């Protein structure tokens, strides 16, 4: 696997992106209704578009109703509203995030999601071009002056991905080397970030799974890199947050319809390279965010630093194994605890004891 093009962090955001009246601060607002509060983060300061939903997972609970901790805590997902694009600020806001929420709109009050896919695709093209070009312009006066090999490779990857946008390509979309992206992460351009299509519809067309306009957003996607789409109805997701649980499970059995927002949640986690391993003991099972590509020492560390520094190994026993045995007393007693090096590479999911010192 190549190296992943993205931010060097683990406090990663995901912006809700499209253009304007879709649904964007409706959903922004139901994702507030189901957030962490904001004391809950006392080394943070969150904005007003600004929200933090936990991300839920069936192993986790599994995990919980087989350890009954004093702690359980789950990993998050931060979503950034951002408003839709008039014309910028947008843009500004836009660099502040790492992945996209694209809200289309395919609902009846020209209604046409294609078009918007275009729109908001050369907006962000267009943007990458003149950050490139500006960089083409700084490089070009510094080689006058230096001859750094830095320099050079930097143009001369500079001027690859100019072509390559001006041709109508997406940058996280081109076949890029291991220092390529290394540079291209230096830059942070805005189609290097994933996105996940959210289309917005009537609950009548979302609760019967058939909608007009995807069939060709769906052919237009699979030509633009195959992204996730999720259809989902702003409308009815409102409608359901503002219930309570009794009813709200009610209104669901009786219509045979059913939220999407913890797979979006989920989706969007997943999508700008988030993943999770388990720490699951008596006193605490918790999800770790850690960026997807992270070895086991640097994964360690995120618990504390003396584990990476005193690295001797990580005790891994997968989800499945736990769950077909008894626990970790017979998991052990059947000999499935691997016990993985400096150079392993954490999956998901992956149930972590670390030896150090
Ligand atoms: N029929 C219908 N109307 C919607 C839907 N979502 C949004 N709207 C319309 O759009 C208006 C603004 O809602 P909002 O969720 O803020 O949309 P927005 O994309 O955040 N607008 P902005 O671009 O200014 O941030 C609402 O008053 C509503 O009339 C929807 O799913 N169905
Ligand atoms: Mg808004």
């Known amino acids: 696997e190549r190296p992943i093009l993205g931010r060097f962090s683990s406090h990663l955001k995901i912006?809700?992106?499209?253009?304007?009246?879709?649904?964007?601060?409706?959903?922004?607002?139901?994702?507030?209704?189901?957030?962490?509060?904001?004391?809950?983060?006392?080394?943070?300061?969150?904005?007003?578009?600004?929200?933090?939903?936990?991300?839920?997972?069936?192993?986790?609970?599994?995990?919980?109703?087989?350890?009954?901790?004093?702690?359980?805590?789950?990993?998050?997902?931060?979503?950034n509203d951002?408003?839709?694009?008039?014309?910028?600020?947008?843009?500004?806001?836009?660099?502040?995030?790492?992945?996209?929420?694209?809200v289309l709109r395919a609902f009846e009050d020209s209604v046409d999601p294609v078009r918007?896919?275009?729109?908001?695709?050369?907006?962000?093209?267009?943007?990458?071009?003149?950050?490139?070009?500006?960089?083409?312009?700084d490089l070009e006066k510094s080689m006058k002056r230096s001859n750094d090999k830095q320099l050079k490779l930097e143009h001369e990857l500079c001027e690859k991905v100019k072509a390559h946008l001006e041709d109508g390509k997406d940058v996280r979309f081109g076949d890029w080397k291991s220092a390529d992206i290394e540079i291209l992460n230096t830059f942070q351009l805005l189609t290097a970030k994933p996105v996940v299509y959210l289309v917005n519809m009537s609950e009548k067309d979302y609760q019967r799974k058939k909608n007009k306009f995807l069939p060709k957003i769906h052919a237009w996607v699979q030509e633009h890199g195959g992204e996730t789409i999720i259809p989902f109805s702003c409308?009815?997701?409102?409608?359901?947050?503002?219930?309570?649980?009794?009813?709200?499970?009610?209104?669901?059995?009786?219509?045979?319809?059913?939220?999407?927002?913890?797979?979006?949640?989920?989706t969007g986690f997943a999508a700008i390279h988030l993943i999770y391993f388990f720490t699951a003991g008596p006193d605490e099972?918790?999800?770790?965010?850690?960026?997807?590509?992270?070895?086991?020492?640097?994964?360690?560390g995120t618990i504390h630093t003396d584990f990476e520094r005193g690295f001797?190994?990580?005790?891994?026993?997968?989800?499945?194994?736990?769950?077909?045995?008894?626990?970790?007393?017979?998991?052990?007693?059947?000999?499935?605890?691997?016990?993985?090096?400096?150079?392993?590479?954490?999956?998901?999911?992956?149930?972590?004891?670390?030896?150090?010192?």
């Open 285 to 300: 099972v918790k999800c770790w965010q850690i960026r997807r590509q992270t070895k086991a020492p640097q994964a360690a």
């Open 15 to 79: 912006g809700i992106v499209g253009l304007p009246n879709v649904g964007k601060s409706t959903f922004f607002n139901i994702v507030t209704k189901l957030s962490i509060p904001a004391e809950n983060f006392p080394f943070c300061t969150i904005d007003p578009n600004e929200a933090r939903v936990y991300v839920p997972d069936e192993r986790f609970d599994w995990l919980c109703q087989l350890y009954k901790p004093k702690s359980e805590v789950s990993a998050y997902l931060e979503i």
């Open 312 to 357: 001797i190994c990580a005790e891994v026993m997968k989800f499945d194994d736990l769950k077909e045995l008894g626990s970790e007393s017979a998991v052990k007693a059947a000999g499935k605890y691997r016990q993985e090096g400096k150079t392993y590479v954490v999956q998901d999911g992956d149930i972590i004891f670390f030896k150090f010192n």
């Open 235 to 266: 409308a009815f997701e409102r409608l359901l947050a503002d219930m309570p649980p009794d009813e709200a499970a009610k209104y669901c059995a009786e219509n045979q319809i059913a939220s999407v927002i913890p797979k979006i949640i989920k």
């Open 116 to 137: 918007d896919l275009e729109t908001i695709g050369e907006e962000l093209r267009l943007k990458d071009i003149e950050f490139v070009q500006n960089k083409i312009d």
């Open 82 to 102: 951002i408003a839709g694009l008039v014309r910028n600020a947008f843009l500004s806001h836009i660099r502040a995030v790492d992945g996209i929420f694209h």
